[PDB]
Amino acid sequence: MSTFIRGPICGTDNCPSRLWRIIDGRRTCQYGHVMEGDVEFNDDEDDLNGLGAGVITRRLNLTTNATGSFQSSQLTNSQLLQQQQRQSHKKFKKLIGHEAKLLFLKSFQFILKRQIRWLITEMRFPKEFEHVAKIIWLKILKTINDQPQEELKLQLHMTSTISILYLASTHLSLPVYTCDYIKWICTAKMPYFQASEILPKSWRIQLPNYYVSILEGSISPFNGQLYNKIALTCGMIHFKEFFNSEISCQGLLLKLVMQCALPPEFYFYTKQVIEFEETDIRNLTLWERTDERHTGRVSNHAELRVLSYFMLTINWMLSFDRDRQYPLKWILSLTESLTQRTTTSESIGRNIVKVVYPDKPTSSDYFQWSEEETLEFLKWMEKQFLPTQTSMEMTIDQKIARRKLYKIFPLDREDSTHQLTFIEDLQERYAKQTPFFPPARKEAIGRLLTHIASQLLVDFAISKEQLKDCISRIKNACLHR
Amino acid sequence: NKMSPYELVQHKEESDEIGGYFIVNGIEKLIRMLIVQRRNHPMAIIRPSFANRGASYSHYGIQIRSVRPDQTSQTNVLHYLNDGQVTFRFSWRKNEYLVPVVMILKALCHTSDRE
Amino acid sequence: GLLNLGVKDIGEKVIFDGKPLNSNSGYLGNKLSVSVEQVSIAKPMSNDGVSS
Amino acid sequence: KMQYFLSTGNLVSQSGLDLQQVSGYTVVAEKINFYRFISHFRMVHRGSFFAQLKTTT
DNA sequence: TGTCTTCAACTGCTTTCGCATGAAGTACCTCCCAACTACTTTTCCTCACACTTG
DNA sequence: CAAGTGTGAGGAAAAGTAGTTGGGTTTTTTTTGCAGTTGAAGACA
RNA sequence: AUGCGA
């Protein structure tokens, strides 16, 4: 403990306690006896005209009458205050380096897991989807630790997480990429685009030392951007050796035929050309671990080639259907019916993806936006943009002001199921073409192909020419009969 | 100023608040009214201070307390000196100044002595 | 009101930068008329966290 | 400055406003009794300087 | 060289005892603090042109 | 004619810190009564 | 010191 005495103790009895009798004017023994002082000073009368400029003023360097014999204090250096304030304004983050990276690491860790479980709820793909995804990143982590020391090139990127989920899904081979991406954007199924979730509140603050803040969808994918990292992850992963049948899916073909001019025959046509020179009669697999940092026209992005065969098939098939199985007036009817139209969720989604306002292929639909499409758009904004967010501080005043403002314009709401489903729309346009049974048709064919180029290209990293660069590639591949 | 009693109660006040006072640092203060010489009118006064001004001062004198539209006032005194001299009193920067009244007369308007 | 008549009667307070200009000097180095035109009083208001 | 003067009643200016004193101009409304409150606004003072006079005329 | 007379400027006080116990003054000067908007700082992420080959 | 190595810059964002202004304490150093007395202007032998 | 009880 501290001691007593920093003023007085009763030298009579050894009782080191002190009483104050303010009525007496006396400092006395708390336990025992006597007068600790008869003298008592400063409780002035009725005479303080205050002429005294009394410039002095206490400032704790001349001590004090000590009128508390009660004490404990401590040795002081001289006004903690600055050290006190330094300590109050300390708990923040002020980190950086390996430590910051570990939590940057951690946060990345968590959001992916949150991503995966919505994955299960949406797809109901049992322990299986969950555990494969976990070891996939366990494998990813393995590599990160090795080149540690102070290496802080963890790639990841807003893209890396979905590449991870993508590769894991392919191992399992549940779906597709474009479909997955459009679905995800449309329903914000992924926690992908905003990184505020986590349960970081704190990770947010850990002055995620430059790292973390870089979290949060930062932006939407360009041309490559996303197929490139998948390759990096595979090289990171050595994924092809580890997992079976990657990039495959007779389901992407189905998705694609139904996508539009779904021809109860073009599935087998394109499946056949794929059969053909499409990797020698074999389901093309996940490209490799493009180890090199330059990431060139890998192009063996299997799907990228699937869409290419898809397109090719259509015009080849349709611009030498000698037997005339596909009528002149039939081709434009399909492209016809195609013109825009609502979407039991899908087309509305593709509008939401179009609105990344990229290379201006959908920008104008931006403009046009077929009436309601306009309406169900604002509907999806009032539901799925709300998370939007929650000024912290800056007046519990402006927060209030903001609230008031919102209240003011209160916005929202100052046979049913109109937006029919997907296979409903699909049915009704193949019916809209159900009347089935020279220069112009060539033009029509080109017209139609540009459209699909729009569609397939729009879900994906496009390259208003890589696409065709891609196209060009297999064109060349083909003529070695 | 213009609140009806009901509104005044709705504003946490004594339904009859007369006002007229000032809340300064929370303490209600009003300015005490003062009785001063009636403005703008010459009041004939005999005062021994006038003798206290110096030699040749009589008791007699006139005091008019002129107040401007803005209500600031300026007191003007005439003294009859025992010698017949008339002096004009005024105050500026709270200092007193004496001038012969015939000076302020010839100064106000161009005139003859016979005027 | 009384206060605005008062400010109309106080008039001006003139100051010369000390004539300089190098008659420049003697005939003042420009006049610097100053004054108070109007006086307004507003009902008590309080804005917190300052502006905004 | 006017809160100053209104808080002490020491009105000071380079003219003295033509007043014989520089204090006492302001009083606390002292709401201890409604009578007291209304009476302040019907109180009129001859001024402190005559409080200083020794006579009673 | 010696003594006297009147007037004007300066000194000290003119109720006792206590409550509200004292309070906040205010010219002249300013360096520090709180604010709104714009600019700058640190870590991290991703792709391209050229030289040489078939 | 064509496919594959080598490598420096282009790009995005939250939190902190810059420029310009203002607010704002903090900071600091004009007679109104009495009774007595000294020095004066004036006068004398 | 201003107002006030006695």
What's the rounded Cα separation, in Å, for the pair A469 and A475? Answer: 10
Which chain B residue lies closest to C6 (C-alpha atoms)? B70
Question: Which method, experimentally, gave rise to this model?
Answer: cryo-EM
DSSP state of C7: H
The H or E element spanning position D4 is: helix D2-8
Kindly report the length of chain A: 481
Q: Are A253 and A271 in contact (CB under 8 A)?
A: yes
Q: Are B60 and B78 in contact (CB under 8 A)?
A: no
Q: A282: which 2 tokens?
A: 């074999």
Say yes or no: Cβ of D24 under 7 A from any atom of strand G: yes
Query: Which nucleotide shows the minimum CA-to-C1' distance to residue A196?
Result: F14
Q: Which residues of D touch B77 (CB under 8 A)?
A: none
Q: Which residues of B touch D7 (CB under 8 A)?
A: 24-25, 29
Is C39 touching B (CB cutoff 8 A)?
A: no
Please give the torsion angle defined by the CA atoms of residues D32, D38, D40 and D45, in that order, rounded to the nearest 10 degrees: -150
Phi/psi of residue B63, nearest 5 degrees: -130, 115
Between the CA of A290 and the C1' of F22, what is the distance in angstroms?
60
Measured N-to-C along each axis, helices A178-187 and A346-354 cross at an angle, to the nearest 10 degrees, of 90
Q: Are A208 and A103 in contact (CB under 8 A)?
A: yes
Q: Are D18 and B95 in contact (CB under 8 A)?
A: no
Q: Is residue D37 classed exposed, middle or buried when 0-12, 13-18 and 19+ CB atoms within 10 A define those classes?
A: middle
Between the CA of D16 and the C1' of E15, what is the distance in angstroms?
32
Name residue A328's amino acid. L
Handedness of CA D39, D42, D47, D50 (dihedral sign): negative
Name the 3-class secondary structure at C16.
Answer: strand
Say yes or no: Cβ of D23 under 7 A from any atom of strand G: yes
Name residue A65's amino acid. N
Q: Are A316 and A276 in contact (CB under 8 A)?
A: no
Name the 3-class secondary structure at C11.
Answer: coil
DSSP state of D41: T
The reply to whether residue D25 touches residue B34, judged by beta carbons under 8 angstroms, is yes
What's the rounded Cα separation, in Å, for the pair A412 and A405? Answer: 14
Query: Which nucleotide shows the minimum CA-to-C1' distance to residue B91?
Result: F30
Q: Is residue A229 classed exposed, middle or buried when 0-12, 13-18 and 19+ CB atoms within 10 A define those classes?
A: buried
Q: Are A133 and A165 in contact (CB under 8 A)?
A: yes
Min Cα distance B19 → chain D (Å) is: 10
What percent helix, strand, coil does chain C show, rounded to 5? Answer: 15, 5, 80
Say yes or no: Cβ of D26 under 7 A from any atom of strand G: no
* CA dist list (Å): A332 to A33, A309, A391, A448, A470: 115, 21, 55, 7, 26
The 3-state secondary structure of chain A, one letter per residue:
CCCCCCCCCCCCCCCCCEEEECCCCEEEECCCCCECCCCCCCCCCCCCCCCCCCCCCCCCCCCCCCCCCCCCCCCCCCCCHHHHHHHHCCCCCCCCCHHHHHHHHHHHHHHHHHHHHHHHHHHCCHHHHHHHHHHHHHHHHHHHHHCCCCCCCCCCHHHHHHHHHHHHHHHHCCCCCHHHHHHHHHHCCCCCCCCCCCCCCHHHHCCCCCCHHHCCCCCCCCCCCHHHHHHHHHHHHCHHHHCCCCCCCHHHHHHHHHHCCCCCCHHHHHHHHHHHHCCCCCCCCCCCCCCCCCCCCCCCCHHHHHHHHHHHHHHHHHCCCCCCCCCHHHHHHHHHHHCCCCCCCHHHHHHHHHCCCCCCCCHHHHHHCCCHHHHHHHHHHHHHCCCCCCCCCCHHHHHHHHHHHHHHCCCCCCCCCCCCCHHHHHHHHHHHCCCCCCHHHHHHHHHHHHHHHHHHHHHCCCHHHHHHHHHHHHHHHHCCC
Between the CA of C48 and the C1' of E31, what is the distance in angstroms?
24
The residues facing A21 across adjacent strands are A26
Which chain A residue lies closest to C52 (C-alpha atoms)? A398
What's the rounded Cα separation, in Å, for the pair A170 and A237? Answer: 14
DSSP state of B32: P
Q: A189: which 2 tokens?
A: 């199924």
What's the rounded Cα separation, in Å, for the pair A189 and A175? Answer: 15
Q: Are B40 and B64 in contact (CB under 8 A)?
A: yes
What's the rounded Cα separation, in Å, for the pair A404 and A389? Answer: 17
Name the 3-class secondary structure at D43.
Answer: coil
Q: Are C33 and C17 in contact (CB under 8 A)?
A: no
What's the rounded Cα separation, in Å, for the pair A28 and A125? Answer: 82
Phi/psi of residue A445, nearest 5 degrees: -60, -45
The residues facing B76 across adjacent strands are B64
Q: Are A178 and A467 in contact (CB under 8 A)?
A: no
Name the 3-class secondary structure at C22.
Answer: coil
What percent helix, strand, coil does chain B show, rounded to 5? Answer: 15, 40, 40
Q: Are A266 and A257 in contact (CB under 8 A)?
A: yes
The reply to whether residue C9 touches residue B70, judged by beta carbons under 8 angstroms, is yes
Task: Name the residues in A350-389 having a C-beta closer than 7 Å to nucleic acid strand E.
Answer: none
Cβ-Cβ contacts under 8 Å for A343 (sequence gap 6 or more): A349, A350, A351, A419, A422, A425
The pairing of beta strand B27-31 with beta strand B22-24? antiparallel
The residues facing B23 across adjacent strands are B28
Cβ atoms within 10 Å, residue B9: 13
The reply to whether residue B72 touches residue C3, judged by beta carbons under 8 angstroms, is no
Say yes or no: Cβ of D37 under 7 A from any atom of strand G: no
D26-28 sheet: strands from edge to edge: B22-24, B27-31, D26-28
The H or E element spanning position B49 is: helix B48-52
Q: C27: which 2 tokens?
A: 């005939």
Is B75 touching D (CB cutoff 8 A)?
A: yes
Cβ-Cβ contacts under 8 Å for A441 (sequence gap 6 or more): A319, A328, A331
Name residue C27's amino acid. Y
Say yes or no: Cβ of A433 under 7 A from any atom of strand E: no
